[PDB]
Design a protein around this ligand. Structure first.
Ligand SMILES: *[C@@H]1O[C@H](CO)[C@@H](O)[C@H](O)[C@H]1NC(C)=O
Ligand SMILES: *[C@@H]1O[C@H](CO)[C@@H](O)[C@H](O)[C@H]1NC(C)=O
Ligand SMILES: *[C@@H]1O[C@H](CO)[C@@H](O)[C@H](O)[C@H]1NC(C)=O
Ligand SMILES: *[C@@H]1O[C@H](CO)[C@@H](O)[C@H](O)[C@H]1NC(C)=O
Ligand SMILES: *[C@@H]1O[C@H](CO)[C@@H](O)[C@H](O)[C@H]1NC(C)=O
Ligand SMILES: *[C@@H]1O[C@H](CO)[C@@H](O)[C@H](O)[C@H]1NC(C)=O
Ligand SMILES: *[C@@H]1O[C@H](CO)[C@@H](O)[C@H](O)[C@H]1NC(C)=O
Ligand SMILES: *[C@@H]1O[C@H](CO)[C@@H](O)[C@H](O)[C@H]1NC(C)=O
Ligand SMILES: [Ca+2]
Ligand SMILES: [Ca+2]
Lengths: 49, 461, 49, 49, 472, 473
């Protein structure tokens, strides 16, 4: 009976973790999509890292 | 008090998330990739199944320069005239060993400023056979693949019609222009899209190593011309001025606040993040206003002219502005967390991280020590064979991709049959079963301790 | 533009040639949308192509 | 070039004396759009539609 | 205090890094890249599409040697050859073969009347030594390993001797073509042929860096062709420039550091502190000094004997025998790379400056015995699965051809790099059972046990350091 | 004593490893690869790109037959034999067979009996044709029963085909076989009633004493299309030729003695001592090991005792050598032996308890198994619930969910990250991405972590009990 109870009581924590993960992912995705815009095809190390 | 900060942050974020929309929604990527396919992968001629990306010989370069290049330059095109230049080295710049000089009588060192050649060669007629310094050649460094190339060299500028450029390149090929001393060659031009508003500066470099063969590389840079003829322009102009007002408000309130906390202000993470955001924003605004007040040659070359448009001082600033207005967006987005950490079940998830960061940084140091040991071993073992470990940066990035599951393992095993698989197996085992679990151990212990102290010392009265 | 394209025995090719020669949908034609039917007597299932 | 396609693989598949119980003759339903289109685009063509 | 050890180790690390940076001359990769592209990817003829990497029969091999090989070897400006107008071809290339003798195995009496000849797989005890063909030259007479200055090779199927039937080609295409045509007319590759080697070298005087090229073709006893290649950029004219003298001085500085370390370590265990092996850093130090002295010995032994280069210089119309130098250079590179890796992980002896690093190091050291104990069980299970996979797919898949290939493939399954389209078709039942059970037990059981052990150990260490401290 | 059983187990393991090394000989993989690439990768002719692996119609089968097949089979050196790589001798003659069904074995609806005049059912034993057809002169046009043909069932991909049908034995020369297949193609042999076709032959390769049996099957489903499959199996039927073979025979005898010792030791204990004996999990492993070993010994004895097919083939060598049963039993023996080796190696955990860390881990695993089973019930229920949804929604369009077991395998491959989204996405615009994203989240974020919670709790509890009992007594 424990397995069902645990997943029921950890829902707020798991939802908070997913919200943080998706906010961080949105930030990084916008950084990446706005970062290149060049089509250089070379080791632009500072921008490549 | 908190509500005012929340509403002003949402306003500053809603203006910013639509100000960046006008930067990524201009379809510049489509134009750049259209030009890339137009100039790169089209075959030199129908009888050769080769393109600029797969050049391998000097004759391939001569075929390309009279071929797909002319077709692309001649068929919203040809801002002024293109230019082609070369950098070469000096006979005798390297020393032949004594016991072998009886058979070999020429030595051409790798490219260096000290070994560069400045004497005239061939028929002393014009600019193609005389050395011009960097200061009067209107150029700068390039930072190529196997060396860093100066802005000097032997240059020649073509003309506005296909026939005369073809005649010029045929004359150059007739009396040999690319000897054994030729180390690099550059082709530069500019194209005006003229459709809505967009330039494109195109640079092509071919490198001749001291051993043999060629190495091609390319660089396309889309500029930007500012003009307001549609509501889609005035809307972004208003957004930009409101954004500038927002930085003004933030900086004036920061100056107001620092008066009371001249030293007791730089200990909290949020305030230092705010000040780095505002300084990045003011730098971006300064670069933007510097660049926008340079419309004097952007339209001067639209008329038919026979001069090379030296559009490098603008591309550099266009590149430098993009990759600092991107980190600003990242930092603005990650400041939203401060407003999120107000729920009763959300402040635990933030205090946990703020309490375990001290140990996370130290274990990151140790992890990177081990990571660099593996990277250096891989560089020393697979350096000359694999092409994924050809340079140290490539070794680091290849290891990072191996962690994420981007293995090749074919040439890794081919290069070295023993100590090649050993490296792979040990790296995978340690990075998959041991090393990446310690971060989770630290986080777990911190979360347990935080929860225990928060639920035991509180929730008892 | 409903074209029957019938004449099962031999004149289907004649009808296709007549349509091509008369320029049925030469210019200003977006899609073709050809579709008839199927019937597998053994398995007992029909099919729409 | 879809007319050679139909004449080579479609009509033999439909009217051939082989395994193809059609259960009804085929059909064609094209569009006209009531307006012509410009010629082929030199270099790059339309993006999607 | 202790900072003396820190500064000594920092100086040693700087010297080692200087040595390895000088050893790793930039853009040597492109040299070998162009050589390998010229000799390995060119089609064997204008008509066909096969290259050296895709040889399939003996006729393909004969088309290679009258084709791409000769086109790449001989370039147009007797006169010497320059492979890319820069790489000088040294002397002449050499072609050798190893073959077995007819009757080297036994045909069962049941069908002896139908089959007359059998040729065993290659082995030293079963190789032919008798003359054959038009017995006039050295290509038809067996020459011993000692009279040929050869050595073993360790190919893919077997380890081949340094003897065999050899021929030295010419300096010009117009004579090498004739020699190869003459070898092709009078059949030189029969059913007894087991291996063939082609060897040569180039110089490229621009940089100071030789290149030794060896190509191998193996003919298994079941028909077919297996090709292999090796390009090694040696360096034998060490002292030409100032940086060369700088590296030479750094070498003797490294020798002094190694001598100091070994004398200090042996002084520490003369009669002082018998059996210090209970510690871990001491074992690391003794491993480092052993590896360093082995590398120094290898370097001294391979650099004091370059007479094979003096001779070739006396007469530049012979075969330059440089395979021993390439082999020892590879050995030296392996030893040096391992030594550098083990030296780098010695920083953990010194990163204890704050308290957080001390806690992290204590936790890392205290979770060693539990992790070793569980790794024993993990590897028992891993090897059981590897043996099952080897016995089931060992003749069909080619990722399970050998036991070590099975181990590597199992390590790559975890990262998701296999097909499973060939695993499922090689065996429809017991094929997918292995895959599903392996994935389940590796992901949902063993990884979680590793993390559970680490979490418990970290919690206990933090707890008892918070108990003994701040409470006394 | 523990030492006695330990040392006898190590001896058993050594002899098992010797047997496995002996049976897995020198590189037979290269033998198999050369044969497979010769017969499966060469294009059917010099102008097409189709090989046997990518057959798509009945005319492609005819192109392959009088084509790449004869090119690979017959190699030029009075009616001289053929050596495939100048080393592999072709044994006797190849054979070609087909299995058919009957016309009118189907049910056409009465409202459609005017444009549909013939329906052929799917293959089944109760529906296969047995009547002569075409130019009914030879054996290719006359049915032959399974007993007159020495055949057996096959278990192909679509169905399990019997060992009967219409067959031909080809010739030893290229010209005669080409004429035979041209005659078969002229007087139509493969028609709409054809359901399966087999090609069978064998080679020897006297260099390494090892036969190779080759079977190629082409299935023609009732719904149309072509499905090819292949099988190359190496065998060893003349074992005793070298000293190593005698060494292997001695090791096999030693293995039989060890198995007898283990079974008698088992029965000496199960008799009276500890009648229950089943609450250990080590006794179950021992009994399954001995059962697998005795099954393998029985299979080996039944398989190597009769080689009368080889003896009959050695009388005259112009006939078809029938080695299919030997290959079938070789595959069965290989499977049984591999599983036995795996379990014998697993049995080693019974002896690694030499310190206080091994016992801790073993106790942890033993105490965790029960609730791991308890939660694995739920994990498998949810896994099968996702699998059946994938089967019902994507099972008719995607080829990766076409069968239920294939759905299970694809779901296991998704965990490793070996997913191809390029085909699943357009199979259903909605419910396609939903299935994928929910599966990934609830498999990595939820169900993978409950296993950790359980294991972590039981390990910590075991350590706490072992540290509270100790240092307090
Ligand atoms: C320059 O080249 C010529 C021939 O190309 C050669 O004779 C001369 O030695 C070279 N110069 C030096 C300094 O080697
Ligand atoms: C280089 O120097 C300045 C840069 O604008 C200019 O006056 C001069 O004409 C340039 N030289 C050229 C364009 O050849
Ligand atoms: C090979 O050896 C056998 C054994 O004596 C002999 O009969 C046969 O003629 C030999 N064949 C050749 C080609 O040497
Ligand atoms: C073998 O070499 C001798 C010496 O030159 C030559 O006369 C003879 O023709 C050669 N044999 C053949 C078959 O060419
Ligand atoms: C082997 O080395 C010796 C060195 O004294 C040399 O004379 C001999 O020619 C070499 N062998 C061959 C086949 O060249
Ligand atoms: C198959 O049977 C149907 C009636 O059962 C008959 O009309 C048809 O002609 C038959 N076709 C062949 C090929 O025997
Ligand atoms: C059937 O076999 C007989 C046997 O003599 C032969 O005469 C006849 O030609 C064969 N039928 C065909 C169609 O070839
Ligand atoms: C089946 O086996 C028997 C036993 O020798 C043999 O006589 C018969 O020819 C075989 N069947 C066929 C079709 O060859
Ligand atoms: Ca020491
Ligand atoms: Ca027992």
């Amino acid at each position: 009976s424990v397995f069902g109870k645990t997943l029921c009581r950890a829902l707020p924590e798991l939802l908070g973790v997913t919200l943080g993960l998706v906010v961080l992912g949105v930030a990084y995705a916008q950084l990446a999509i706005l970062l290149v815009s060049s089509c250089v095809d070379s080791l632009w190390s500072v921008a490549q890292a | 008090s908190v509500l005012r900060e929340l509403v002003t942050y949402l306003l500053f974020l809603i203006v910013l998330c639509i100000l960046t929309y006008g930067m990524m929604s201009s379809n510049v990527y489509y134009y750049t990739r259209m030009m890339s396919q137009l100039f790169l992968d089209t075959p030199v001629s129908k009888t050769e199944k080769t393109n600029f990306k797969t050049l391998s010989s000097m004759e391939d370069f001569w075929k390309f320069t009279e071929g797909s290049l002319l077709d692309g330059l001649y068929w919203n095109l040809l801002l002024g005239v293109p230019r082609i230049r070369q950098l070469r080295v000096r006979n005798g710049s390297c020393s032949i060993p004594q016991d072998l000089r009886d058979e070999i009588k020429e030595c051409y060192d790798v490219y260096s400023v000290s070994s560069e050649d400045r004497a005239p060669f061939g028929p002393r007629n014009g600019t193609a056979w005389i050395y011009t310094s960097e200061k009067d050649l209107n150029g700068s460094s390039h930072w190529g693949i196997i060396a860093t190339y100066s802005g000097a060299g032997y240059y020649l500028d073509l003309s506005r019609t296909r026939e005369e450029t073809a005649a010029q390149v045929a004359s150059l090929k007739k009396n040999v222009w690319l000897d054994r001393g030729t180390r690099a060659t550059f082709i530069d031009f500019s194209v005006y899209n003229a459709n809505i508003n967009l330039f494109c500066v195109v640079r092509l470099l071919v490198e001749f190593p001291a051993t043999g063969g060629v190495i091609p590389s390319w660089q396309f840079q889309p500029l930007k011309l500012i003009r307001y003829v549609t509501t889609f322009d005035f809307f972004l102009a208003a957004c930009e001025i409101i954004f500038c007002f927002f930085i003004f408000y933030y900086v004036v309130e920061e100056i107001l606040e620092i008066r009371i906390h001249k030293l007791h202000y730089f200990r909290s993470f949020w305030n230092c993040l705010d000040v780095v955001i505002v300084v990045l924003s003011v730098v971006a605004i300064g670069i933007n206003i510097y660049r926008t007040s340079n419309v004097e040659v952007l339209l001067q070359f639209l008329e038919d002219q026979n001069t090379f448009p030296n559009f490098e001082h603008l591309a550099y600033w266009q590149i430098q502005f993009n990759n600092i207005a991107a980190v600003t967006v990242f930092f603005v987005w990650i400041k939203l967390f401060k407003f999120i950490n107000f729920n009763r079940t959300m402040s635990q998830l933030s205090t946990t991280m703020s309490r375990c960061a001290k140990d996370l940084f130290g274990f990151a140091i140790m992890f990177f020590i081990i990571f660099l040991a593996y990277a250096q071993l891989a560089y020393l073992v697979f350096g000359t064979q694999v092409d994924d470990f050809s340079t140290f940066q490539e070794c680091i990035f290849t290891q990072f991709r191996i962690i994420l599951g981007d293995i090749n393992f074919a040439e890794i095993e081919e290069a070295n049959r023993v100590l090649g698989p050993i490296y792979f197996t040990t790296f995978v085992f340690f990075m998959f079963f041991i090393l990446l679990n310690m971060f989770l151990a630290i986080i777990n212990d911190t979360y347990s301790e935080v929860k225990s102290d928060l639920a035991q010392q509180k929730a008892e009265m | 533009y409903v074209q029957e394209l019938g004449l099962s025995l031999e004149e289907s090719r004649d009808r296709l040639r007549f349509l091509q020669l008369h320029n049925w949908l030469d210019n200003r034609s977006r899609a073709v949308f050809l579709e008839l039917t199927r019937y597998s007597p053994a398995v007992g299932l029909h099919a729409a192509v | 070039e879809l007319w050679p396609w139909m004449a080579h693989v479609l009509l033999p598949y439909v009217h051939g004396n082989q395994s193809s119980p059609e259960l009804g003759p085929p059909r064609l339903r094209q569009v006209r759009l009531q307006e012509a289109l410009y010629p082929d685009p030199p270099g790059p063509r339309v993006h999607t539609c």
